[PDB]
Amino acid sequence: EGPASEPDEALVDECCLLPSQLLIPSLDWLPASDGLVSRLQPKQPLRLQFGRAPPKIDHLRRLHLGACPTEECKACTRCGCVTMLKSPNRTTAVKQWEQRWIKNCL
Amino acid sequence: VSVNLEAFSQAISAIQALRSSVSRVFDCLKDGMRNKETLEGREKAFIAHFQDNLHSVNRDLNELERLSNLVGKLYSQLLQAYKWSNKLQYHAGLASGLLNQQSLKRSANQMLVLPPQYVDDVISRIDRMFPEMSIHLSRPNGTSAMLLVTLGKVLKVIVVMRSLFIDRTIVKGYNENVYTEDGKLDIWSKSNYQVFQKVTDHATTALLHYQLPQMPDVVVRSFMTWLRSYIKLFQAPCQRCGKFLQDGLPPTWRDFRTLEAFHDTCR
Ligand SMILES: [Zn+2]
Ligand SMILES: [Zn+2]
């Protein structure tokens, strides 16, 4: 309860020896910066035109796509996640997990 | 023999190509399925691209095995010299070949006499190679040179040269008499054969063609080299009409710098 402690050097070195035994495959950052809230500035009006808009992964179910994805997908407005439109496995899938994202994403 | 060097270089290229082909195969298969707009083309394109890489790998392995069947069995500063010397002769060898073709001179002027031993030794130096050629020299009249050149069992050439400059040529067959009644060289006569008259005309054109302005030895060397090609006569057909005979005459024209047989009518 309120540790306020720093890890000892033994832990530091034993985790230093970790990548010599375990490879780190990859990681993906979900909050893709595409909103206009972080781009606008005060007293600086912005003029934007139509259709200008001045390693692809399925973020919901951990499925890798090709260099150029084949099937169309859906993109969240706020978070910006991309997920497959029609899931491939429906007869054998976790219905407690798929039913939680049919309406909206977090 | 130097063929082993080329074989080794080709083997190195083949093994590099094999490694690159394997890497290409695995990378292309890792890339995955593309879009290719409609569905039907998407299906065919991936298979077509996948088959070609494997076929290339098999072809490279097959040609590598074909080569394997074909193949068979202070100092440093010294080597630095050697690898430099052969780097010079080639470097100039191209540079002399490109500047002579594009001659920029317009006139020899700004704003002949040779010792007989010089000509004799030059002609002997020509005679040492081309074992089929045999050359005999004489000077019945003055300082002008009369040379009899026999070629195989086919040709006998009489050449009159004026101070090492070639001036006149007459050729004849083998069985024809070349000497006169007195025993000297017969200069003014004809070969009594149409083909030999045509090749006398060809030799006159050739001597009118090879004309260097200040190197006279290369001129006679080129003339002898051109005359060398005629030994193969009656065994080689024309390169255009296929057949040997055109109007009863065999190919009697040898192109300059590209020594191949041709009929006179075929140019
Ligand atoms: Zn979301
Ligand atoms: Zn012809």
Question: Quick one: tokens of A84?
Answer: 């497959």
- Report residues near ion ligand 1: CB below 5 Å: A 76, 79, 105
Structural tokens at position B250:
């065999």
SS3 content of chain B, % helix, strand, coil (to 5): 50, 15, 35
How many whole angstroms from B234 Cα to the centroid of ligand 2?
Answer: 13
B149/B220 Cα distance (integer angstroms) = 13
Distance from Cα B15 to the centre of ligand 2, integer Å:
47
Q: Does A23 touch chain B (CB under 8 A)?
A: no
In this complex, is the C-beta atom of A92 within 8 Å of any C-beta atom belonging to chain B?
Answer: no
The alpha carbon dihedral of A97, A90, A73, A28 has a sign of positive
Indicate the DSSP class of residue A84: E
Does A67 contact B at CB distance below 8 Å? yes
Candidates B148, B210, B202; CA nearest to B179 is B148
Cα separation values, B148 from A70, B172, B258, Å: 86, 11, 26
CB-based contact (8 Å) between A88 and chain B? Answer: no
φ and ψ of B232, to 5 deg: -75, 0
Locate the chain B residue with the closest alpha carbon to A55: B31
Q: What is the dihedral of CA B165, B171, B177, B183, to 10 degrees?
A: 0
Could you give the C-alpha distances from B258 to A50, B226, B261, in angstroms and in order?
Answer: 68, 10, 9
A66/B31 CB distance under 8 A: yes
- Which residues of chain B have a CB within 8 Å of the CB of A69? 35
Residue B203 CB neighbours (<10 A): 21
Tokens of A78: 């706020």
Q: How far apart are CA B93 and CA B88, in angstroms?
A: 8
Instruction: With beta carbons less than 8 A apart as the criterion, state whether B226 and B155 touch.
Output: no
Q: A66–B42: do the CB atoms touch at under 8 Å?
A: no
Q: How far is B18 from chain A (nearest CA, A)?
A: 26
Which residues, at least 6 apart from A93, have a Cβ–Cβ distance to it below 8 Å? A87
* C-beta separation of A101 from A83 below 8 A: yes
Interface residue A2 vs chain B (CB under 8 A) = no
Q: Which ligand is nearest to the CA of B244?
A: 2
Q: Which two tokens stand for residue A51?
A: 């259709």
Cα separations in angstroms, B65 against A101, B11, B52, B53:
59, 10, 20, 18
Entry resolution (Å): 3.7
Q: State the structure-solving technique.
A: cryo-EM
- Closest residue in B to A72 (Cα) is B35
Q: Cα separations (Å) of B179 from B138, B142, B172, B195?
A: 13, 19, 12, 21
B42 inside 8 A of chain A by CB: yes
Q: How far apart are CA A69 and CA B34, in angstroms?
A: 7
| Gap between the Cα atoms of B126 and A101, Å rounded | 97
Q: Do the beta carbons of residue A30 and residue A83 sit within 8 Å?
A: no
Whether A66 and chain B come into contact, CB under 8 Å, resolves to yes
Other CB atoms within 10 A of residue B149 CB: 21
CA distance A86 to chain B (A): 17
3-state helix, strand and coil shares in percent for chain A, rounded to the nearest 5: 15, 10, 75
Cα B217 to Cα B124: distance, rounded to the nearest angstrom: 12
Q: Which residues from chain B sit within 8 angstroms of residue A68, using beta carbons? A: 34-35
Closest CA to B52 of B29, B31, B32: B29
Q: In A, which residues are within 8 Å of B39 by CB distance?
A: none
CA of B163 to the centre of ligand 2 (A): 38
Location of structure tokens 């317009």? B106
What does the alpha-carbon distance between residue B174 and residue B196 come to, in Å, rounded to a whole number?
Answer: 11
Q: How far apart are CA A41 and CA B193, in angstroms?
A: 104
Ligand found nearest the CA of B241: 2
Six token digits for residue B203:
């030799």
